[PDB]
Design an enzyme around this catalytic site. Sequence first.
Site, mmCIF file in Angstrom:
data_model
loop_
_atom_site.group_PDB
_atom_site.id
_atom_site.type_symbol
_atom_site.label_atom_id
_atom_site.label_comp_id
_atom_site.label_asym_id
_atom_site.label_seq_id
_atom_site.Cartn_x
_atom_site.Cartn_y
_atom_site.Cartn_z
ATOM 1 N N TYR C 364 0.779 -1.239 0.000
ATOM 2 C CA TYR C 364 0.000 0.000 0.000
ATOM 3 C C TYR C 364 0.810 1.288 0.000
ATOM 4 O O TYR C 364 0.250 2.351 -0.292
ATOM 5 C CB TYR C 364 -0.957 0.020 1.199
ATOM 6 C CG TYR C 364 -1.980 -1.095 1.155
ATOM 7 C CD1 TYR C 364 -3.085 -1.020 0.302
ATOM 8 C CD2 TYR C 364 -1.819 -2.230 1.913
ATOM 9 C CE1 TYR C 364 -4.000 -2.044 0.226
ATOM 10 C CE2 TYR C 364 -2.730 -3.255 1.867
ATOM 11 C CZ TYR C 364 -3.826 -3.176 1.014
ATOM 12 O OH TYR C 364 -4.749 -4.218 0.932
HETATM 13 C C1 F43 Z 1 -1.410 -9.398 -0.326
HETATM 14 C C2 F43 Z 1 -1.965 -8.944 1.026
HETATM 15 C C3 F43 Z 1 -0.881 -8.043 1.601
HETATM 16 C C4 F43 Z 1 -1.398 -6.665 1.224
HETATM 17 O O1 F43 Z 1 -0.711 -5.642 1.208
HETATM 18 N N1 F43 Z 1 -2.712 -6.715 0.926
HETATM 19 C C5 F43 Z 1 -3.236 -8.081 0.879
HETATM 20 C C6 F43 Z 1 -4.067 -8.310 -0.409
HETATM 21 C C7 F43 Z 1 -5.025 -7.122 -0.603
HETATM 22 C C8 F43 Z 1 -5.898 -7.174 -1.920
HETATM 23 C C9 F43 Z 1 -6.401 -8.603 -2.221
HETATM 24 C C10 F43 Z 1 -7.058 -8.726 -3.616
HETATM 25 C C11 F43 Z 1 -6.707 -10.042 -4.293
HETATM 26 O O2 F43 Z 1 -6.976 -11.115 -3.713
HETATM 27 O O3 F43 Z 1 -6.159 -10.001 -5.414
HETATM 28 C C12 F43 Z 1 -7.005 -6.155 -1.584
HETATM 29 C C13 F43 Z 1 -8.439 -6.420 -2.148
HETATM 30 C C14 F43 Z 1 -6.591 -4.689 -1.897
HETATM 31 C C15 F43 Z 1 -6.487 -4.482 -3.407
HETATM 32 N N2 F43 Z 1 -5.314 -4.532 -3.913
HETATM 33 O O4 F43 Z 1 -7.495 -4.273 -4.065
HETATM 34 C C16 F43 Z 1 -7.033 -6.352 -0.057
HETATM 35 N N3 F43 Z 1 -6.065 -7.013 0.456
HETATM 36 NI NI1 F43 Z 1 -6.099 -7.934 2.312
HETATM 37 N N4 F43 Z 1 -8.142 -7.741 2.409
HETATM 38 C C17 F43 Z 1 -8.961 -8.150 3.379
HETATM 39 C C18 F43 Z 1 -8.595 -8.750 4.556
HETATM 40 C C19 F43 Z 1 -7.375 -9.315 4.776
HETATM 41 C C20 F43 Z 1 -7.107 -10.361 5.862
HETATM 42 C C21 F43 Z 1 -7.817 -11.645 5.415
HETATM 43 C C22 F43 Z 1 -7.659 -12.759 6.466
HETATM 44 C C23 F43 Z 1 -8.541 -13.979 6.209
HETATM 45 O O5 F43 Z 1 -8.679 -14.817 7.145
HETATM 46 O O6 F43 Z 1 -9.128 -14.115 5.093
HETATM 47 C C24 F43 Z 1 -5.574 -10.459 5.873
HETATM 48 C C25 F43 Z 1 -4.989 -9.639 7.023
HETATM 49 C C26 F43 Z 1 -5.197 -10.376 8.324
HETATM 50 O O7 F43 Z 1 -4.802 -11.583 8.429
HETATM 51 O O8 F43 Z 1 -5.766 -9.741 9.274
HETATM 52 C C27 F43 Z 1 -5.264 -9.821 4.536
HETATM 53 C C28 F43 Z 1 -4.045 -9.954 3.956
HETATM 54 C C29 F43 Z 1 -3.569 -9.429 2.670
HETATM 55 N N5 F43 Z 1 -4.096 -8.447 2.024
HETATM 56 C C30 F43 Z 1 -2.378 -10.062 1.983
HETATM 57 C C31 F43 Z 1 -2.819 -11.358 1.263
HETATM 58 C C32 F43 Z 1 -3.396 -12.424 2.216
HETATM 59 C C33 F43 Z 1 -3.438 -13.770 1.537
HETATM 60 O O9 F43 Z 1 -2.350 -14.233 1.109
HETATM 61 O O10 F43 Z 1 -4.529 -14.434 1.509
HETATM 62 N N6 F43 Z 1 -6.286 -9.099 4.020
HETATM 63 C C34 F43 Z 1 -9.676 -8.811 5.620
HETATM 64 O O11 F43 Z 1 -9.426 -9.129 6.797
HETATM 65 C C35 F43 Z 1 -11.152 -8.545 5.294
HETATM 66 C C36 F43 Z 1 -11.310 -7.526 4.158
HETATM 67 C C37 F43 Z 1 -10.403 -7.906 2.967
HETATM 68 C C38 F43 Z 1 -10.274 -6.842 1.895
HETATM 69 C C39 F43 Z 1 -11.379 -6.884 0.825
HETATM 70 C C40 F43 Z 1 -12.725 -6.328 1.301
HETATM 71 O O12 F43 Z 1 -12.743 -5.441 2.203
HETATM 72 O O13 F43 Z 1 -13.761 -6.735 0.706
HETATM 73 C C41 F43 Z 1 -8.894 -7.140 1.298
HETATM 74 C C42 F43 Z 1 -8.174 -5.879 0.817
HETATM 75 C C1 LIG Z 2 1.495 5.933 3.372
HETATM 76 C C2 LIG Z 2 1.328 6.815 2.122
HETATM 77 O O1 LIG Z 2 1.973 6.202 0.999
HETATM 78 P P1 LIG Z 2 3.479 6.620 0.587
HETATM 79 O O2 LIG Z 2 4.414 6.027 1.622
HETATM 80 O O3 LIG Z 2 3.543 8.108 0.534
HETATM 81 O O4 LIG Z 2 3.604 5.940 -0.762
HETATM 82 C C3 LIG Z 2 -0.137 7.084 1.786
HETATM 83 N N1 LIG Z 2 -0.838 5.824 1.648
HETATM 84 C C4 LIG Z 2 -1.778 5.398 2.529
HETATM 85 O O5 LIG Z 2 -1.917 5.935 3.636
HETATM 86 C C5 LIG Z 2 -2.612 4.201 2.072
HETATM 87 C C6 LIG Z 2 -3.964 4.202 2.807
HETATM 88 C C7 LIG Z 2 -4.964 3.229 2.195
HETATM 89 C C8 LIG Z 2 -4.449 1.792 1.994
HETATM 90 C C9 LIG Z 2 -4.218 1.088 3.343
HETATM 91 C C10 LIG Z 2 -5.463 1.097 4.251
HETATM 92 S S1 LIG Z 2 -5.174 0.181 5.790
HETATM 93 C C11 LIG Z 2 -0.217 7.860 0.465
HETATM 94 O O6 LIG Z 2 -0.388 7.252 -0.652
HETATM 95 O O7 LIG Z 2 -0.116 9.105 0.492
HETATM 96 O O1 LIG Z 3 -1.773 -8.227 5.016
HETATM 97 S S1 LIG Z 3 -1.785 -6.792 5.376
HETATM 98 O O2 LIG Z 3 -2.178 -6.602 6.779
HETATM 99 O O3 LIG Z 3 -0.484 -6.118 5.052
HETATM 100 C C1 LIG Z 3 -3.055 -5.987 4.418
HETATM 101 C C2 LIG Z 3 -4.497 -6.379 4.762
HETATM 102 S S2 LIG Z 3 -5.629 -5.801 3.520
#
Ligand code: F43
Ligand SMILES: C[C@@H](OP(=O)(O)O)[C@H](NC(=O)CCCCCCS)C(=O)O
Ligand SMILES: O=S(=O)(O)CCS
Lengths: 560, 560, 433, 264
Positions: C364
Amino acid sequence: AYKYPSEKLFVEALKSKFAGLDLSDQKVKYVRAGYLQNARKREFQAAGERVAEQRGMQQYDVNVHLGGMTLGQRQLVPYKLSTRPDIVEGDDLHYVNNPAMQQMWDDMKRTIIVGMDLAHETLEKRLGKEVTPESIAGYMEAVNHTMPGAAIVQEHMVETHPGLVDDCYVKMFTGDDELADEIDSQYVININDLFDKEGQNEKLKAAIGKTTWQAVHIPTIVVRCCDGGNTSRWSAMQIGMSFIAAYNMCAGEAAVADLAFAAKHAAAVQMAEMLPARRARSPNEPGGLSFGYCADMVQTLRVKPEDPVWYTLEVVACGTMLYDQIWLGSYMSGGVGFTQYATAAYTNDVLDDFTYYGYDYALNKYGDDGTAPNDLATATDLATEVTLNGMECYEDYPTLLEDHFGGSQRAGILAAASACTTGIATGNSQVALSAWYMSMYVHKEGWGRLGFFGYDLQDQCGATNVCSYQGDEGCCLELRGANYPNYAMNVGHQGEYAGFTGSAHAGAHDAYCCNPLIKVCFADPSLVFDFSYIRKEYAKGAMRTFRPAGERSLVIPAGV
Amino acid sequence: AYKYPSEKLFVEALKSKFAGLDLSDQKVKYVRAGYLQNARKREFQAAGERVAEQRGMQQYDVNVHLGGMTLGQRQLVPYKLSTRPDIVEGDDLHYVNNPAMQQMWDDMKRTIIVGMDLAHETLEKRLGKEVTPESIAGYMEAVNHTMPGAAIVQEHMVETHPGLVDDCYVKMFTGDDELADEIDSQYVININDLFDKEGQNEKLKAAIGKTTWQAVHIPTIVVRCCDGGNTSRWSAMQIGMSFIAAYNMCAGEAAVADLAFAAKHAAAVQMAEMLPARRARSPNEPGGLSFGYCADMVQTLRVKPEDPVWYTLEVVACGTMLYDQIWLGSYMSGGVGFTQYATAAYTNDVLDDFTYYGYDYALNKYGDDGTAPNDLATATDLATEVTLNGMECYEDYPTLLEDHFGGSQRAGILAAASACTTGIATGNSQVALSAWYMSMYVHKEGWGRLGFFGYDLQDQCGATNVCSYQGDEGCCLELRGANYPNYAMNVGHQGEYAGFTGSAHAGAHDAYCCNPLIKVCFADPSLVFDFSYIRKEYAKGAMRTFRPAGERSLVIPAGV
Amino acid sequence: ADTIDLYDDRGKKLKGDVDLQAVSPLKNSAILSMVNTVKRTVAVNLAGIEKACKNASYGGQSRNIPGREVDIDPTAKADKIAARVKELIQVEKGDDTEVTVLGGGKFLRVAAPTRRIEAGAEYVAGMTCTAAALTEALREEYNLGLYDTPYVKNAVWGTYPQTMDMKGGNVLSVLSIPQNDEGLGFALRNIMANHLAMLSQRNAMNCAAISSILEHCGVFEMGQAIGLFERYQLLALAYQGLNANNMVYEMTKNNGKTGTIGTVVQETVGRALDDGVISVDKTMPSGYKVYKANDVCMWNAYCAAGTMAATMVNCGALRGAQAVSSTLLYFNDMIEKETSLPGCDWGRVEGTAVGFSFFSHSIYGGGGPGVFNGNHVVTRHSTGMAIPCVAVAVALDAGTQMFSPESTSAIVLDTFQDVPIMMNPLKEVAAAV
Amino acid sequence: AYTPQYYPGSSHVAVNRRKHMSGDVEKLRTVSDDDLVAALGHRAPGADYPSTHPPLAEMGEPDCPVRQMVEPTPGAAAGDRVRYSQFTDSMYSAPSIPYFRSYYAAINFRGVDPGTLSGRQIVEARERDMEAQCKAAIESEMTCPALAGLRGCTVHGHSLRLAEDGMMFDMLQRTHIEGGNVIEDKDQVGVPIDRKVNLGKPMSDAEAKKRTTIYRTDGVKYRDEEEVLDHVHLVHHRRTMYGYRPETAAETAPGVGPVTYHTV
Ligand code: F43
Ligand SMILES: C[C@@H](OP(=O)(O)O)[C@H](NC(=O)CCCCCCS)C(=O)O
Ligand SMILES: O=S(=O)(O)CCS
Ligand code: F43
Ligand SMILES: O=S(=O)(O)CCS
Ligand SMILES: [Cl-]
Ligand SMILES: [Cl-]
Ligand SMILES: [Cl-]
Ligand SMILES: [Cl-]
Ligand SMILES: [K+]
Ligand code: NA
Ligand code: NA
């Protein structure tokens, strides 16, 4: 007073998702059906086939998911909008797919409130004009012709198509009942009719006083082409044209510049101010939206103040969608985004069950709405009880835990129920904020987990910054917002903060939280989105029954 | 070489607007018909009647114009798009009413260019991965599934409707022909096919080198709900997800953050940077758009470089509409706005006549394109002759002066013709800039008027700031833009500056002006708007034959 | 009043029984000098100016303006250019203006006269007067004229003034432009961790000192060291950044062969107890002891020293920067579990670390540790008790990072490697008392 | 020297938490080096460790007093890549919970970068050091191979109903039961591997509840662990008090009210 019932509020949604299921079962049979189990995924796959064929380039394909598996190796479950009968597929709550959610934000972004008193004083001082109900009425007709983009002074002007800007208008409002009664009712927000419960109208009129304001709503299509920074400027340009015509001014004399400064700056009340460089944004964008203003935009409080929980949870619904799905999930990131991080707060009656449980606990222990001690001991008691009860619900109902499958969802909902209970009980937003952080600390130790990797940045900074008075830490919750430093990044908090800011004022039986001008402005039924019942609107969007403004069907081809 | 013909290029449009008219007449009969003369105004009045009835509140009404007069006390005249047969009503060129114009800006705002070399080096260094044409091909498939908003890693994700995001895609481009040939053509911008004239392909490949880039175009609907700041962030999120899948990374390890910093910052090439507080805006908004970048987005140069004037005036059409109608006339103001301030530069073949006249004068006096002396004496000669000739045309053809009825329109067109002539002749943008200010000063003394009240702020600061080297004054024209301090406020300049920045490189027979990456990115025919023929696209929008992206018909109701 | 013993980067005592106030940003002449130096010193990339002109690559990011090359060779004339720059910016002969040629002509260090800062309101006069003097020096030396000088000006100043910063330019400060401040008083907080590692020449003890000093100078400018909060901040500066009582050095030495984050937690608690900073308060039925802080600000300072030593032990063992985010988190989470007392900055180090971990391991934003700073939205939240540990971790990294000090901050190393306050900050602070 | 106490509470769940923190975890199974390397997926079993930089002895180091007194780990000395292991643990009484995996790592191992999330817990370290840390965890009572598993991506499952056979849901099904034993036949990011890694029998439901660190209503109810609740409250209260003013007087400032604890 409210009495918490014998059946949990979330049970109906569980039974409607899982007909015939024993809700105590900790195990399930996995069939690994993949995407074909789900009508919406199948529709998306077919849509992606057309997209690819029409443009000559691959786009959506469920088979691109990694690991040789498509979505739906487990059951893909739909979502009931809380307090509504509507059950929708999860994708129907993605902001991109949901016009109600888009129009809610567009309605906020395209609004500016502009005082009229300074402009009138300018006309009197500089030109010696008399301002009367008759002159104001002529001005209100002028501004409703010009504001959507039509000409009043020059010759050979081109203009916006009125049908493309049908949502743009201007109304006035005032605490002076005598003036309000003289102007044609089509041009006036009637405070007395809209705020007829618990003397709210008198509270608003006393706070606004004998001052006059314009609620300006520029066209949705404009903010869609442009940004929120357009709003105060567009408003001021057409206010100025209308004063020129309605008061027979020179069309461009020095006094016109005083009107411009008044309308753009001195008498202008933005929804949100600008943001710092790393997240540079114009005014009237979500990061600048304070929690008090967000709570004041929602209007359930004028409909049914005798149930403070309902208004509270409509604010949660408003804020969690806007702040998590659109702001954090799009403006600050993008992609698939953050739908379910937010849906947890407004679907399946889960937060409602946990919050009404707390409301009942507080009513019985501390007494009526808003009478509980405004202290850390009370926040501790309410947060711990509400959080323990919620965690026990997730432990006793396996499909509830499976709904809020991500710890971040669970953390925000348990803490929102805790803080909303504390807000209603104490009537104090700042004490509720201590309760919010206490919930997170309690939760973490019970399960040895909380949220995502970076969920509790604000959490762990949280308790110590509730009562700090240092420059970049101290701030009452009403004036905090999505740019409060600790809050500037993460899902699962901002909309819940707006919700319990509302809860504290609902518990106190106030008519508003932070700005009475915002409260009156957003009560007006001429807005496209119905700010009085947020979750009902979201259901319409998810069901493809919400008509938004800003479409271009009038000026585009169609054909085979 | 080019030879200027015996009949002025603007005569056709005059004869098509005024069948049977003696173009020498200085007098006319005024019939004072009002709005009923004009089909578009009558349609607008009827649209305003429906709007008012549907919402219970007055909106557009021609009779609100002041003075008891409606628009059209003189004849209301239509506009021919320059080089096109299409004649349209003036309102059809208002940006709000013209989807081609809206989509041009949306195509720019939703674009970000992102290097791949640093990402590939991260994978090699930190994970020890090998990057091959096969792994890149897998990445390109992943990113074209995920970019529009679909899932690749997690289970139970909700996704965007593919049909609402059908304009979103990613292509790669590279100066390494061997890599380009190894990747499926659907994913590659083919520099050799698109840039087949005058060796332009070789110039671009030499400038880019053996480096690899992605041209990312996020969904139009996203930048419409949000802002240009969303673009680089959205792009980076889905680039990140795609690297995770394509290289079997941990889905969230330290190396992923290096990819994020690369995609968001280190290897990111924004269309525009942020703006200062008074005009606070996110990146990728028009105020931050440099003139060199604007000229490089226009693609007529790759189609027909042997006619430098055509590409030059397509750039003028691109810039004047964007900077005056959308940026200055909406983002920075609003209302009826600034349609005709810009149409003067792209309609009725007027600027074309004045500029081809200058081109012929320069070719005959100084010789071939780009070979005239790069000095103040040459700028003086060319600007004076071109300006005097154009003034004589306005004086000898009364309906031409009636078309450019505002001094500002005349000023911008005379000076654009002067500066574009100078740019083509000298091949030097900075010398052309001296010519622009010379035209203004000559014009002012001939007629004792120039533009609107504030038109020549930059004008009078202008000559002295061309060759200043002081901190907030000195700047080559290619790097100036809509935030160069003297330029930050006023209509009738910015798009013309972009035009003659293009004219200088067209005269020198270069393949681009400022950034070869921008040049290659915008040559891609998979964009919605056709950047190779701007005025033809504007005609489609004005005729309701341009299909834009971003509409919500798939998820909204219709009904009676 | 509080006193501290000052120790150097090798664990040797420099000065005993020093008043805490004598190391204040408001009083210590070496700290005040460090701030003045970072404000008024700029690095000039003459090689970059030459390349931009010869290649018409004004503004960077693959820009090329065909035909507008200006063929000048300032690296070959660096001594003449340096002398002209000095004459143009110096206010009075013998003032503190310095212009030095570095890298054989590739770079200049320019220390603009303090009087130019004093006569203005901010710190930018060094950057602007240097850029102006350079532009004039090049115009003169190379006989530039009306229509080519503007391009050379962009070689120096970048895309300014179309942008607010000198983007793609060749004049560099360790500070940023004021408009990048997140809030009031943040300019000295906006110093990239990679830069701090280069200021210190990768001496981790000196990095802790430089970074801690500048962070707390920022906190003072923010108005967050008033009244009781002055003692709170000064004790953290002294114990975490200035190796007070040799605690950071000795804890690191004691845990350096076989220790972990957890063993450093244990030693910090034991020291606080032996030194009387904390005491047993009550005992739970299980035998778990709740502690109490007898000196609240001192307990924080001990936790800050422990957080630093834990970074040195854990990132030192990894020889990798990335573990700093988890070190700051888990040192403080576990010291709270061990004691029932709040951790460093009452949770704000832990909270900073939670988000910093996330934004150094996710899609992110953020990046590796070297891209963070006290003004970064992710890492701003503690009042100076987190970033010095980040900079130390960056210094300790043996080559795991893509965006490393050598790849982002090479010119900072050359500009400051001979600058006494950055070579031996602990010795200079003690000598100034 | 100071004797650690680690964590409050008196139930067997609190005892288990102190076992994980102190590293006093029983070894329950053996996983061969080659099997574990295959499961982690970073290099072929038996292959040399790839490097991200040269060995420290070969390239030298800056003159830093900290480097000169902190011993590098074996993997750092060799210049290994930083690689990872990542585990997911069921909320249905898995032995481990995320934060306590991270405390185990932080207390008991050198040069580690642990991260805690709800559905995944990660340890990054130099490759050979990471392998040793993962071996310790996976062979110990911290692991039931049905209720926990290696998942470097696609982690969904910690909060889901278990499958009918007691395996935690894995969208990629990297593990399955054969003959009573859990077999892993894909690496941690879902790529099929050319072997069957035998992780042995799942714990009985009763054994899992005896070994778990989680509180829940079907085991040790969180509401009854008053010492942990007291701890949480004390830390929150003192944080709140000192953010206002960092002094003992803040502990009775107006607004604190009648704070009270169960066991102290
Ligand atoms: C790649 C990451 C690291 C990162 O920076 N973001 C990810 C992935 C990112 C992608 C996943 C899209 C896809 O599948 O292609 C998106 C949708 C953001 C996007 N790029 O649009 C997202 N997560 Ni994440 N992500 C979520 C969540 C979570 C939960 C899921 C845990 C479980 O048991 O399923 C965990 C964090 C945790 O353990 O607390 C999590 C991790 C992760 N999150 C791990 C991938 C986990 C995996 O390998 O399965 N997300 C959530 O906890 C619920 C909401 C959900 C978001 C989508 C929505 O809000 O509908 C999504 C929000
Ligand atoms: C940290 C900062 O990113 P940079 O370190 O500046 O690239 C900032 N992003 C965010 O705060 C991402 C918020 C939304 C995605 C994570 C939600 S938990 C931004 O784009 O200005
Ligand atoms: O797996 S991470 O906590 O970095 C992101 C959840 S959407
Ligand atoms: C009220 C001002 C003062 C001001 O701040 N802006 C005005 C009006 C503003 C309004 C007029 C809308 C309406 O009629 O209701 C708008 C459209 C901006 C808006 N608010 O949307 C506009 N002008 Ni003006 N304005 C214009 C112009 C002009 C020219 C018109 C001269 C003539 O002979 O007709 C003169 C300046 C001059 O003398 O140079 C001018 C003045 C003025 N302009 C005088 C009113 C003039 C009058 O009383 O008739 N505009 C132009 O010169 C051409 C472009 C034209 C703009 C609309 C378009 O671009 O289509 C419009 C641009
Ligand atoms: O009349 S003014 O020049 O002020 C504005 C013209 S649009
Ligand atoms: Cl099953
Ligand atoms: Cl007549
Ligand atoms: Cl005080
Ligand atoms: Cl104290
Ligand atoms: K928009
Ligand atoms: Na239509
Ligand atoms: Na439809």
